[PDB]
Amino acid sequence: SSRRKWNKTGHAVRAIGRLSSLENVYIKADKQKNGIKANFKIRHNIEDGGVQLAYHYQQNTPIGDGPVLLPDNHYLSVQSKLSKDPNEKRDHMVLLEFVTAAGITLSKGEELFTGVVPILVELDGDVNGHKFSVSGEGEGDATYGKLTLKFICTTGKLPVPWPTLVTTLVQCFSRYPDHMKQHDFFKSAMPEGYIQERTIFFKDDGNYKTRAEVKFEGDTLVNRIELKGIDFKEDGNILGHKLEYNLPDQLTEEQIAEFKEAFSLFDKDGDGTITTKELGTVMRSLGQNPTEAELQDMINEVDADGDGTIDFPEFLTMMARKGSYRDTEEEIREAFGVFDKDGNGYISAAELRHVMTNLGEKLTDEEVDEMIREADIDGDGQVNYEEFVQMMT
Ligand SMILES: [Ca+2]
Ligand SMILES: [Ca+2]
Ligand SMILES: [Ca+2]
Ligand SMILES: [Ca+2]
């Protein structure tokens, strides 16, 4: 009962947190090279709690002379599942991906991706002097933005965690909606292909420099990559293999139920969609003052159909992703600061009362005190950072 209030409010706060962040693959045109630039952020869960961030900068240039499509600013959204082959002795990765383009509200090479295309991947790498090779094969179905691939480390033991290689290991398989067909540089550069260059900064650790050639060889789409890693800590999350491999399908029906409870705090008229006005209302009642522009930006970050609203499914998707990948300490501390309005490091009854009252949740002072009780571990009559965290898991 009180836990439900903590989780509902918590989920609402973390939802605004997510809508404030930039979690997609952001693509912009680069006229100087008739290609595109991209930038994005990857969250890698750390085995025993915590998250390792990987910041990506990306550049793509066509290989051929033929005309290509230069996109308006937009993004790709990616869902990955990593798994193992039960009958594989070798160090390997089974990878399933769904990639979809969005971010804009409501070519010849494209023809090559109408059906299922075979894929081959070859990677030679060197990180802090630890050399390795990866070879992968599978297929892509751009109609659904689907990729399915199996990768083998052909030199024995992979000296870095599989998850860190994923973004390096064919964005031409992304699904562009009809109203965005003209923004698909990747397919447009086919069959001759493109060079794709990245630098990937692992926070508080080393970096990768990758150069890859993505093109058709016969009927097969082939990605050939070289990767150099430097400045890695030998006992860090990467070289020390401290990153989790997979996340669960989870979503205990109770979790979805909680997501829905959070959703209905935003959807105050119960039409199954959240507007800029609704998102705004909640944000203000939490003590923020975003402008209409910002509201539109936040919605566009998750607005799959481009209708300018967050509908219930889009919200569920957003929350499922937010539940998969852990938040940084700073993010949790900001969430905390939403309650800890004086910044003293402690959530007092008066503060929790201010929040719940402004939120519209009408309860008695005794109910507030009960919430504090449910949260209070050490018994000081307040909620501190650590208690907050242990509450929001
Ligand atoms: Ca609504
Ligand atoms: Ca929508
Ligand atoms: Ca306080
Ligand atoms: Ca306490």
Question: What is the C-alpha to C-alpha distance for residues 283 and 338, in angstroms, rounded to an integer?
Answer: 10
Alpha carbon of 262 to ligand 1 centroid (Å):
13
Please compute, for residue 324, the number of CA atoms within 13 A of its CA located in the half-sphere on the CB side: 20
Resolution limit, Å: 2.7
Paired residues of 133 in beta bridges: 124
Contacts of 97 by beta carbon, 8 Å cutoff, 6+ apart: 78, 79, 80, 81, 145, 146, 147, 148
Is 87 in the same domain as 213? yes
| Ligand 4 centre distance from Cα of residue 348 (Å) | 9
340 alpha carbon – ligand 1 mean position (Å): 29
User: Ligand 2 center to residue 200 CA distance, Å?
Assistant: 31
Burial class (CB in 10 A: 0-12, 13-18, 19+), 301: buried
How far does residue 260's CA lie from ligand 1's centre (Å)?
Answer: 13
- Considering the domain architecture, whether residues 63 and 197 belong to the same structural domain is answered as yes
| Strands 25-30 and 130-141, sheet pairing | unpaired
Number of domains comprising the chain: 2
Looking at residue 87, its amino acid is: N
Give the DSSP letter of residue 112: G
Cα(374) to ligand 4 centroid in Å equals 10
Q: How many whole angstroms from 386 Cα to the centroid of ligand 4? A: 9
The parent domain of residue 131 ranges over 24-249
Q: Check if the beta carbon of residue 245 is closer than 8 Å to that of residue 151.
A: no
Ligand nearest to the CA of 268: 1
Residues 6+ apart with CB under 8 A from 71: 27, 28, 29, 36, 182, 183, 184, 185
Structure tokens at 137: 């094969």
Q: If DSSP codes are grouped into helix, strand and coil, which group holds residue 157?
A: coil
| CA gap 103, 80 in Å, rounded | 20
Pick the ligand that lies closest to the CA of residue 349.
3
**Are residue 322 and residue 225 in the same domain, yes or no?**
no
Calculate how far, in angstroms, residue 268's C-alpha sits from the geometric centre of ligand 1.
Answer: 6
What single letter denotes the amino acid at residue 36?
A: I
- Using DSSP's 3-state secondary structure scheme, residue 106 falls into coil
Residues 214 and 352 in one domain: no
Pair (200, 314) in one structural domain: no
For residues 183 and 301, membership in a common domain is answered with: no
Domain end call among 199, 229, 249: 249
Q: How far is the CA of 381 from the centre of ligand 3 (A)?
A: 12
Q: Where are the beta strands (DSSP E) in 245-297?
A: 273-274
Point out the domain boundary residue: 249, 273, 295.
249
Expressed in angstroms and rounded, the spacing between residue 91 Cα and the centre of ligand 3 is: 50
The 3-state DSSP class for residue 306 equals coil
Q: Which two tokens stand for residue 143?
A: 């109609």
Which ligand places an atom closest to the C-alpha of 391? Answer: 4
Q: Are residues 221 and 271 in the same domain?
A: no
Structure tokens given for 366: 């005794």
- Residue 150 shares a structural domain with residue 212: yes
Where a domain ends, among 215, 249, 283? 249
Three-state secondary structure along 181-224?
HHHCHHHHCCCCCEEEEEEEEECCCCEEEEEEEEEEECCEEEEE
CATH of the domain at 93: 2.40.155.10
Report the separation in Å between the CA atom of 384 and the middle of ligand 4, taken as the mean of its atom positions: 6
Ligand 3 mean position, distance from CA 342 (Å): 5
Q: Which residues of 108-146 are buried (b: 16+ CB within 10 A; e: fewer)?
A: ebbebbeeebebbbbbbbebbebebebebebbbbbeebb
